[PDB]
Amino acid sequence: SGFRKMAFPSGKVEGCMVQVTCGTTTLNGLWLDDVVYCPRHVICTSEDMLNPNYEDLLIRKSNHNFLVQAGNVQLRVIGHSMQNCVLKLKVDTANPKTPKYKFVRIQPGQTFSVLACYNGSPSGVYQCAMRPNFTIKGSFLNGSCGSVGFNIDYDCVSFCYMHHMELPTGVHAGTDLEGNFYGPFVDRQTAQAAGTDTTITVNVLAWLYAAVINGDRWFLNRFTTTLNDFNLVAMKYNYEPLTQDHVDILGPLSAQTGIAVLDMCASLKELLQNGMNGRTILGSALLEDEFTPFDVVRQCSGVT
Amino acid sequence: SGFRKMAFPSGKVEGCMVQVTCGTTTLNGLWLDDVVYCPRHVICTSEDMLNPNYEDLLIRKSNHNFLVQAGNVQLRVIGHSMQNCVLKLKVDTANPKTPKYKFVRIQPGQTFSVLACYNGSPSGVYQCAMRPNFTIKGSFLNGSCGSVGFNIDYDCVSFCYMHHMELPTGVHAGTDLEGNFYGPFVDRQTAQAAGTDTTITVNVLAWLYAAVINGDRWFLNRFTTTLNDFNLVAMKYNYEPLTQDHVDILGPLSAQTGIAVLDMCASLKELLQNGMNGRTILGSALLEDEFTPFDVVRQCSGVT
Numbered sequence: 230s231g232f233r234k235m236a237f238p239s240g241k242v243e244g245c246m247v248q249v250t251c252g253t254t255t256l257n258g259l260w261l262d263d264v265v266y267c268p269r270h271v272i273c274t275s276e277d278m279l280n281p282n283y284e285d286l287l288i289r290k291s292n293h294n295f296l297v298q299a300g301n302v303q304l305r306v307i308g309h310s311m312q313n314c315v316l317k318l319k320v321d322t323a324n325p326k327t328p329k330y331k332f333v334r335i336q337p338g339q340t341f342s343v344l345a346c347y348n349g350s351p352s353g354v355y356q357c358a359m360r361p362n363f364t365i366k367g368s369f370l371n372g373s374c375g376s377v378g379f380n381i382d383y384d385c386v387s388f389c390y391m392h393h394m395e396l397p398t399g400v401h402a403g404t405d406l407e408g409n410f411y412g413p414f415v416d417r418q419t420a421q422a423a424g425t426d427t428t429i430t431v432n433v434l435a436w437l438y439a440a441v442i443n444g445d446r447w448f449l450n451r452f453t454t455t456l457n458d459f460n461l462v463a464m465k466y467n468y469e470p471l472t473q474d475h476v477d478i479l480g481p482l483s484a485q486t487g488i489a490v491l492d493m494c495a496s497l498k499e500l501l502q503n504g505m506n507g508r509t510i511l512g513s514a515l516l517e518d519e520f521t522p523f524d525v526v527r528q529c530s531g532v533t
Numbered sequence: 534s535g536f537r538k539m540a541f542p543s544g545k546v547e548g549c550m551v552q553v554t555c556g557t558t559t560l561n562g563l564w565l566d567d568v569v570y571c572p573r574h575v576i577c578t579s580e581d582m583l584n585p586n587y588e589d590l591l592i593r594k595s596n597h598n599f600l601v602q603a604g605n606v607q608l609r610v611i612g613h614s615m616q617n618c619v620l621k622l623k624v625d626t627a628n629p630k631t632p633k634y635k636f637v638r639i640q641p642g643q644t645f646s647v648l649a650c651y652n653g654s655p656s657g658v659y660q661c662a663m664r665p666n667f668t669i670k671g672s673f674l675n676g677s678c679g680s681v682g683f684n685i686d687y688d689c690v691s692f693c694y695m696h697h698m699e700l701p702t703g704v705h706a707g708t709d710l711e712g713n714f715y716g717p718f719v720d721r722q723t724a725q726a727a728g729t730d731t732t733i734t735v736n737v738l739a740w741l742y743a744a745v746i747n748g749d750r751w752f753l754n755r756f757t758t759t760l761n762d763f764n765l766v767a768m769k770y771n772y773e774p775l776t777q778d779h780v781d782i783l784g785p786l787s788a789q790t791g792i793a794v795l796d797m798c799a800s801l802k803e804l805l806q807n808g809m810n811g812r813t814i815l816g817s818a819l820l821e822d823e824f825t826p827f828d829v830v831r832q833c834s835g836v837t
């Protein structure tokens with residue numbers, strides 16, 4: 230029993246992290262097969278970042294201008310290309326520790342583990358969610374760019390995120406591994422404001438199921454609701470609208486606990502309207518939204 | 534910027550996890566050099582657990598009764614001994630992935646990463662604290678026994694915890710790697726109640742510094758206090774007493790932020806007395822106590 234914010238074991242990804250230096254900028258790269266993936270802003274000075282023309286900056290760069298170091302050994306760069314906002318540096322050596330992997334573009338609400346790295350060396354691992362405004366709330370200092378987000382299905386690492394920047398509000402923006410930003414963000418030092426950081430309703434419900442399963446049941450009430458009635462309250466409290474697709478996804482947790490999804494929605498509705506009154510759920514004083522239904526099932530069943 | 538509950542990268546420990554089976558009980562072992570460490574209750578049936586005589590149960594066990602599997606390969610057990618509440622199974626093969634390591638017995642308040650494992654396979658990694666009542670609040674299903682807690686200093690893994698049991702209240706108890714329980718707990722299925730789970734005051738203060746550093750400053754007040762005045766409030770709110778040793782440990786965070794430790798104590802005192810009034814600090818509605826001063830400095834400076 231118990232329920233923890235839990236990251237995937239990071240070993241498979243640790244094996245992929247390298248240091249990329251271009252001139253005086255050092256950040257992290259991901260080494261998969263004979264390709265190192267890194268943020269294209271590695272070619273920028275702090276000056277360049279104000280209005281970079283990446284294609285023009287890249288003309289001034291050759292293979293030998295990108296220094297790739299894996300541990301204390303240098304990799305030979307035999308090719309480089311820019312795909313959207315990432316650089317792909319072809320090296321002469323396949324990463325011998327390349328795990329089974331996929332590049333996936335996740336949806337808002339989806340959770341993933343981040344291996345925070347500095348100079349190509351892992352510092353820590355944490356769990357986070359793609360926010361509905363396509364930011365993430367990370368822990369990233371200077372040098373952490375190119376740190377990656379991932380899920381694991383048994384032995385296959387799905388890479389979903391590469392860290393590129395911090396907004397003036399101290400939230401995080403980055404790309405998938407094809408170099409496409411999540412949301413409307415760009416790798417430029419400009420006014421970029423995030424939209425409304427709404428609560429991931431389906432994730433809250435999942436976590437309320439996790440709570441019931443782990444014996445925290447005080448918030449279960451005597452009411453039910455409908456998707457339309459619930460959504461009116463959701464809207465008011467900056468919760469994401471709940472769809473039938475979310476209800477379907479919650480089916481197994483409904484089945485396990487014998488609490489109909491709309492009943493749990495009615496318990497959530499009362500929690501929003503009445504607050505937690507100084508109570509906690511799974512040791513939280515607010516409604517946790519960075520566990521997916523899949524995360525709850527995984528942790529409650531003990532998938533490895 | 535940003536501040537996350539962050540575990541150590543788990544790869545070094547992933548390399549140490551094995552499956553231990555004795556008869557019909559399967560749990561996890563830690564394989565370091567040519568020794569596999571596991572909970573001695575691996576020799577117990579669910580029946581035995583009510584009043585096990587471990588020395589008597591062990592007489593009925595030979596080297597060949599302990600099945601040790603690392604991936605899909607069996608290890609040959611050439612010796613076994615019981616040290617306190619752990620078994621040490623000598624195998625004929627040194628773990629080739631043995632990291633630099635130490636066994637350390639941590640104090641209450643100290644944080645560590647847990648690699649949750651099932652059948653010797655890692656499921657996830659999370660951060661937790663040795664509670665002042667020598668429990669931890671983990672996420673452990675059946676088969677997770679022998680999962681370990683650890684800190685990393687650069688390349689040296691300090692093993693501090695091995696998971697042994699869940700109390701009837703769903704909190705966790707385990708040993709150091711010499712098999713000595715944290716607190717008064719025993720590997721027997723009996724009435725074992727935890728004492729008061731007090732708040733780790735020094736850790737709250739550290740996390741308030743982390744908050745100020747990351748721009749969350751609304752709770753900073755116009756007051757200071759003394760250790761004796763603060764402690765009277767601490768006592769009342771089931772916070773651990775703050776010592777000069779804790780004040781000294783907070784010195785670097787005091788220095789960095791320019792907020793005297795006793796001033797932050799006075800801000801904490803007001804938060805206890807006045808509550809958070811629906812406000813959050815670092816996205817928490819309660820005062821987080823599972824970051825040490827060392828953790829805050831590490832994450833705020835970006836140690837790898």
Ligand SMILES: O=C(c1ccc2c(c1)OCO2)N1CCCCCC1
Nearest residue numbers: 447503504505506507508509510514
């Ligand atoms: O809802 C509660 C409440 C009840 C029990 C609790 C709790 C809160 O937190 C821990 O256990 N209150 C508090 C007392 C006044 C009545 C209305 C609001």
Ligand SMILES: O=C(c1ccc2c(c1)OCO2)N1CCCCCC1
Nearest residue numbers: 751807808809810811812813814818
């Ligand atoms: O202390 C607060 C408060 C103020 C601002 C906040 C907040 C809480 O949470 C988000 O921003 N209140 C709420 C209003 C009535 C006055 C006393 C209690």
